[model samples]
Target: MVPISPIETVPVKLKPGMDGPKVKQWPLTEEKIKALVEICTEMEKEGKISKIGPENPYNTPVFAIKKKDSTKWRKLVDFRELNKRTQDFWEVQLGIPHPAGLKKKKSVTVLDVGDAYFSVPLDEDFRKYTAFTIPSINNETPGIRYQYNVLPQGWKGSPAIFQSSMTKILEPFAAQNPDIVIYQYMDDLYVGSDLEIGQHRTKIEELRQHLLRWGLTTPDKKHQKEPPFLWMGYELHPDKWTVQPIVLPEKDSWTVNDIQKLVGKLNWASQIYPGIKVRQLSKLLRGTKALTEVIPLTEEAELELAENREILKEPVHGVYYDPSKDLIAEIQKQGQGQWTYQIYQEPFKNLKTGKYARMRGAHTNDVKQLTEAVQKITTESIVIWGKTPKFKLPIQKETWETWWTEYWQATWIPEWEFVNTPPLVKLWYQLEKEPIVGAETFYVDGAANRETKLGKAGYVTNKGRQKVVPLTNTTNQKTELQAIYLALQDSGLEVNIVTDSQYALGIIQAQPDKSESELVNQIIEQLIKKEKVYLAWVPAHKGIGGNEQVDKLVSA
Candidate 1:
């Protein structure tokens, strides 16, 4: 490893209310003593640690523990007392987008820095805070105290310091070099390019020279070159515009710790597989305390987990769109926190251009940002491969209130009047009339889950007309209204529409808002102007023939 040179000394700012010195002592065995000596000796030889006098302010304790089935021991220091007083530093990680348009023959090289943490030189003043004591190898020498001169593991601010320094050193190189893309995650560095081998090798050498200047070492065994390489626990298939998780066999039973770990793993996997709804998994993983507490896997949670696993194992084929640019609304204690909403349109393939486009948008806090993003999205054109453009909308209280009122009015269908005379009976009486002989009867239904929502409308007629389409992210009631609207548009003026959704029928009869009540209002307007449209509700899952047919279509 290259030696890191210290520039300046920085001190740790302890939290207020600290009083007397806190010290801890543990009995050491012969093996532990030997291990400590070996470690301290090596650290001393490298000038990475030094002896401290008793006058030092901090007096932390150290211990050694062996791994399972292994004689190798890892030295650990109990910095809990010291850590409580220190302030935390924020670590900024580099954002690496999925390789959406990379060619199959492109080259990628990965390098891991050796002794990553030790490369960051600790401040001289801060070194005293890391002071720890270990029993001397000889009986006469007594216990010895030492402090770390370089950044050490298990320190709160070490990662932030190292990450900041490395970013400062490498960012310029990345900005200047266009053919090669450089990505860093802590100690790991990945170099990728669609350029020729010679050009790629030159870029890799350039990065290596810079790392040497920064006192960082990249070992030969840790360097690799390949396509579809593994990085940050993800298998990036650039050629296919896909990235999938590296799923290892999980045999542990469901416990709080296990579920927490599973949630973490799936969270990282979700970045690669965007279709998975990891937020629901997060809900299930929350509120877990004891290690032995088992998570109650409900049917919905089971289905979501199964879907997440399938996505992790299989590859999804589509042009990758990164949603990272969209601004997330910040949560607030007051009622004025940011609110977010998303909409996903049905997939469409343009017959003229023979290109596929899937439109999606989410709400943001900035109107200008939202407008700029939306301007880039054209209805007639497909997004260029490898480009991740987002469409965002600003959500205000007035706008939200308007949307809520419209939604409520559109879905506020009246209850079925079964007390005096059932609506179904009245509908049957109307259907028996000779005036209704040529009138059409339509059945509509809708279905929704976490992943997708769909609406279906089927009519009983000689032509056997039917409509089924996927809807943007919405409630089942809204989808049901959409099905009703579509059925009315296609059927005759004397049409009778039957649905299992009571909300859809209620919204049609109740007072409606102007904003979210467009579809329902349109149906009502048509009824007043040109056609006689009647909406009837039937109980769900009661084996009604028309309702069952529409239900089957929606499920399919």
Candidate 2:
């Protein structure tokens, strides 16, 4: 493939003092020496690398490393010294498109060009100093200087130059197609659309033609078949999103370079879901500035990193903003120089506390969004306050009261915590089982014979699962809560638990100071780890299949 345009070949106009001493090549074995020479000879025919003589005053160091998949060794030319002195145009900034635009796209396609940097040819005049001192056998002869014919991988400015080149080629094509969204960074181009798959196909064909006319081509391409397809190192899905995990190196000590890489990955991941705080990482960053060598992992940094790994292992589920749902927000000044900012849509759950709202008439309303991260102060694009974007606000009633009458679009549910506290108060009397997406829902009940202080606790699911455990020294509510925990352990699927007793609801919701048993704590602990437990009130003796089925077993 030819170099991409409107800029033809990448150039390297250098600073004077272009006269430097012959640097000895890195030490290597004879077999490795033979291997390097073979690759050099092969490249001579391919026109990537050329052999040059005594006139070339710029021979830098050359080294080899095994690339990820290939058994063949790869060579990299060192350009650090040359980069520092170069008088080339390096200040140009090329910006990549943000992933936020990808939110509404239902279909996406990725087109790629192989050997991206190598696709740009270096200018002939600048090639004289792009030379690397090729090793000679036995340290007996002077090293030979070889120059790069293409934009070499080791140059500091290759990415920015290549980005500028591709942008010039793609930006024109993108302008012609106002209906499609295209994001280009280096060799990767992601094209997205919201409708008509057939139209999407034709647009890609046009894009390819545009590249071909400019002497550029894609050797590899992936059309959007299904996603969790990656773009810009993010795993994209129609209903969810996540970043690929970074592997923290296991070592006795870490260098400043290691922390920089770690910090970069963390920073990027937060842009996708910016909830994780960077305070500890900030400390780690500052601590590295005073050191030249590896530093012992500080207790603060180690704890922060451990906690981050734990949080990142979980996936984020998502949904596009529903304009119909009320956008709720609260902000206030508190003590200790702290401010609280929270915003969410309705039918939401507090991700950390399992505290959630269910409308009085809408029992089947989702207590939590399908994505566990939603509802409770996670990701929001809008921050509209009082019809103006203001930094400071008076908490006095008149300030908000004026905004409320003028700008508020939805009715505020007063004492929302009391409303959602016990889902029993939000009960549904429907006879049929309500749907809970991807959950094995069970309706549970418990009964105690007052005279005997004896009871039974059990649960039943629509999948023909039924169970009853005889209880002793148990109250009615105690047995109900007990049944909840029992059904939760009934295997690996997530759960939606339902019970008829409000007393049992109060026990779990209030989480009493000194409860009768460890049952409430046990259930809360289980739910906390699980992060996706659902329990709401189902009508008693309503002849609902699961509810009635559990009743029979408890009575038996």
Candidate 3:
């Protein structure tokens, strides 16, 4: 195919300070110089590059780099300085679907384009910015200076432009062949099918014809049609129904930079292998950020890395269960109100009298019935559930409050301690024990603002003791949790914490097995201790003395 004209509409935009003085020539080996001359001669002949006269203001140096796993050297212009001032154009979305299509397919074909970036011509005005010097091959001629007329490798916008061009070429073919899945990442294309070989061959021929018409050439070496294909640095395993990274072993000891590169590869691998843990890999990468040399991994991190290696070797299987369908079934059962409720009653010895006491409760309903049933017993006890409820005219409020408070304070031996205690009973026992004297009550509050992301926690005890803490990188809930932790640390003997944050109160009451933050873990640890610690929610900005005092302090 003949070379196509340059894409005129999208020219590279260079901001001010981009067209600077020419860069100094870099030293090159004799073999590298010969390779550069041959490449430039071919490019000039093909109209991919042209000689830039002395009048050109923008010029950059060139260097040679070996192709990956090859001895062939490729000339690369140092466009770093120019790239800094180049404005970004539109980004091409390279959303390649999972190779699950390969599993369903009977065969696969991979195609590659020849010199992807060099195929797209560059804008005439911006070509001078890519100028590089090449040493004269003959003694008679001086070092010649040239610039790329086509899109070059090191430019920031080259990838996007080339990718856009390829998309434009293949869009129509993709629409026509809906049954044959076509995936492209820049120059590489994968044509997959579950159809017969003849049908697959027909689609491949159609794709080839389109490429020829579009002035794009695909070399015979670049086309592969069969099973077990390599696409986008991943090898598809049809036998195992999985895809994995192409194994490229490092020959030398890895540097900090080399290990950092592996971190990215493993991160991508994590998406392919669901069982491989990437969090530990991330932690190890973070540890190497400040170091220039290789460092030893901690025992814990080393073990985690070994475990991930084993998991990555495991084969992924097809889905056998659908959680979404299971969830729908459970929702249907709930919609019919199929829930059942049970009641439980237990007897324990009261600490004060050393006699057996009974604590009765129902599973589903409110505490009114349980309170009435327990009231019938001669033992001095009252029901403790939800809020301390208002009683009938016959039952005194003072007697009910007194008995409810004492029942929580007493250490009673349960009839079946081995069995899991009810949530309500467990919570009641976890609460601060009733003070033998008067318990110290403290108010805690936290305030935050969006403008500054500034937050503060205020704690004030009834004894006039106050503490103000400046919080950083925190939210209202986090600050509230910190305030409760502070109050617990400051208070003495039996302590009752009053706060307006229901979230903080719930955290304390439920004692979650895992906490979201370090502060929450500390609060949970303190709550579990024998020390008396209770969290109660009160209305914010109300006339309540302690609550209002802490709120004012936090706002201040």
Candidate 4:
């Protein structure tokens, strides 16, 4: 067999008579194929067509033809078939030596498929020169490269298909020696094990037999059970994997710009350091609105980025810098200033009782004690005193009203939490578990709509329907209160309401004189005076089957 060459020796020609010449097909070794790919890749980069496709300015032309015709296989130089073409392509000389850090410490084992052998055989004389265009070749000669009759590099889906095939063949051996980690790219496979010498030897034999079973071959020298192997271009450090940077001839003090460059270089190497680039480049890549758009960096991100730039260099490899000292201190200082600005008032505490009191909600008895303790205050004029004037003695009615409203506003339960809280009241009879029950139960579960739209499956489930009407002007335990009111509307026969959510039920249960539960107290006062409603409690889910089912329907 002739050794494959990426370089073309024969002039572009057509088979028999055709409008244009066919694409140049060559039998190339790996070395020449890699060279051709590199040249095309470089030209693509130079043309600023790095993201090559249909819309590219360079119009990187490609070749394609049906495999059925052999006469169509004749090569063509396709730059619109000019009588003459100019030479303008650059050929960068780069060696394809084994990747850096390729030396082994402990004997390494590799399932090396000598040269390019097919795991799955294809039709004889399959098109070998698929990755080329006549126009690009016509304008400039392709650099020294390698190629082969086997599956070529950079063929989309080749990696996945090849890896899958290799994996399937090695499945039994893998199961036998579960400790070994199988790593592959294309045909190169490395079976690594951290197990003992005996176990490693066993895995090697098993891997060898499996490869043979797949009509594959592995060279003996590359099949040693050892350490310090190179798998998929990564130098496997004795106990771990590490890819040291190519020192690049000289080392210099890494500056801020250098850091930015390093960040850009590592940006696409995310699998190696997923978030490091963003974190390292954070300062330079700061958003127009930092707080609004910027993402928080992890410790690994921060240190790796800083280290890459030599900004906060780490003396030891893998021993990362701790951001706790400098970064943490700066963050704390900034946070403290922000917090101070956000909260203008100083927090107040009780010195005597050593407990912060809800001054506005203090009992009348407590108010009396408070005035006496403060000394020389009329009992009638005495009012609960607190950080705000709302709790001061001779408290204005408006202040109590504001405090109550604001208190409820601050601790308002989220809608999901409200849904999870079962309704307090249970009407024993009139349990028709269809429309009325569903509407009532759903309302208790905080259905948000209007009366006309109150049914669970229809348009009545909007905000207007769900809004809670307070028992009185002073009461504001709305969501649950709404549940009770709607439940009464659902089943006309209302049992006395009992509830774990006491505040909700209290608004209806309080007496007019004891108007602390003023809203409920007022509603109850009016109801009794008008002979309308009653209140009582049932022990939640422990009630009758109807009520228990109502709880389920409520949450649902």
Task: Give the top-scoring candidate (TM-score).
Answer: 3
- lDDT string for model 2 (321-384, tens) is 4444444443332211122333434334211111122222211111111111232233232221
Question: TM per model?
Answer: 0.52, 0.50, 0.54, 0.31
Tell me how candidate 4 scores on lDDT. 0.34
lDDT by residue (451-490, candidate 3, tens digit) is 6768899798877889999877777777788888888777
| Error of model 4, residue 220, in angstroms | 1.3
Task: State, as a TM-score between 0 and 1, how close model 2 is to the true structure.
Answer: 0.50
Which residue ranges in model 2 land beyond 4 Å of their true spot? 1-7, 15-22, 66-71, 87-98, 139-142, 220-226, 229-234, 239-315, 318-336, 340-394, 397-556
Clashing pairs in 1: 406-516, 412-506, 412-507, 413-506, 413-507, 414-506
- Model 4: weakest 10-residue lDDT segment is 328-337
Q: What is the per-residue lDDT of model 1 for residues 43-157, given as tens digits with 9 covering 90 to 100? A: 8999888987878766777889897799899788877776676776664754444343233336778888646557677876667778888876655675788888987777777
The local distance difference test score of model 2 is 0.59
Which 10-residue span in candidate 1 carries the lowest summed lDDT?
421-430
**What is residue 480's positional error in candidate 2, in angstroms?**
64
The reply for model 4, stretches above 4 Å from the true place, is 1-108, 114-116, 123-149, 223-235, 240-259, 264-281, 285-556
Say which prediction, candidate 2 or candidate 3, comes out ahead on TM-score: 3
TM-score, candidate number 3: 0.54
Model 3 CA lDDT for position 396: 34
Q: How are the candidates ranked when ordered by lDDT, highest leading?
A: 2, 3, 1, 4
TM-score of 4: 0.31
**Candidates 2 and 4: which is better by TM-score?**
2
